[PDB]
Design a protein around this nucleic acid. Structure first.
Ligand SMILES: [Mg+2]
Lengths: 102, 101
RNA sequence: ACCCGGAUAGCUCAGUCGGUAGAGCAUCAGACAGGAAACUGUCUGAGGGUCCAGGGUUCAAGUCCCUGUUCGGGU
């Protein structure tokens, strides 16, 4: 789902801006599982374009969505910046670079 | 109640194993205070034997004791390992080194 | 800008009188029933956290006080 060099990037990112907690492998695994429970092709995770399609498919449901959904949307955003080789240090930053594209 | 060199060790020990809080003087003071209310010589604190005597004297009362008592018993244990020059990094280790005997 | 409420296991959430934290799902391993078998079910165990960040009170803070960050809701 992620390359070798990308993992080392992934494992450097923090969940909260000032947090002392950062992403691990468990997040990717769990994300692919929850992707199927929502009737989505988990294969779309290993490409930057696949994530673009997923993120846009979930953008609307976010406003009315549950806390469990936003969490998923966030993890995919962070994972998108890694594929795009965009450098980010925490989830907030990832969401910002994704909104800058619009 | 404590020597100069022992203090430097005392104030390095952590209350909780991974805790970011460490022992200070207020703890030793507070322990001697609670000692007087129970009719015990606080002078027994500045000796390796004095703490050994207290710790064994309170072993029974522990099962039925208050939360504030456990606290006292622990603070005294740490104070014993410092007197004995036994190396400990937190209260937990002190309790372990006392049972290892 | 102001007021209110959240932040705790990979995720959603509980946590009582302050006294070092639990469940559900997820992940791993195992057991039992039916079945030659692939399999279809039922239960059990384990790992996994320092409780957003920084200070303060206290012998002792997830818990009480203040600040910052952040999310949602309201005016
Ligand atoms: Mg969470």
């Amino acid at each position: 789902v992620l390359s070798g060099g990308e993992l080392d990037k992934w494992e450097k990112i923090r969940l909260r801006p000032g947090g002392k907690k950062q992403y691990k492998l468990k997040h990717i695994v769990w994300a692919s599982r929850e992707l199927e429970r929502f009737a989505v092709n988990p294969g779309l995770l290993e490409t930057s374009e696949g994530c673009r399609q997923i993120l846009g498919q979930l953008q609307p449901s976010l406003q009315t969505g549950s806390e469990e959904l936003r969490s998923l949307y966030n993890t995919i955003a962070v994972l998108y910046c890694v594929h795009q080789r965009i450098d980010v240090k925490d989830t907030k930053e990832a969401l910002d670079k994704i909104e800058e594209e619009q």
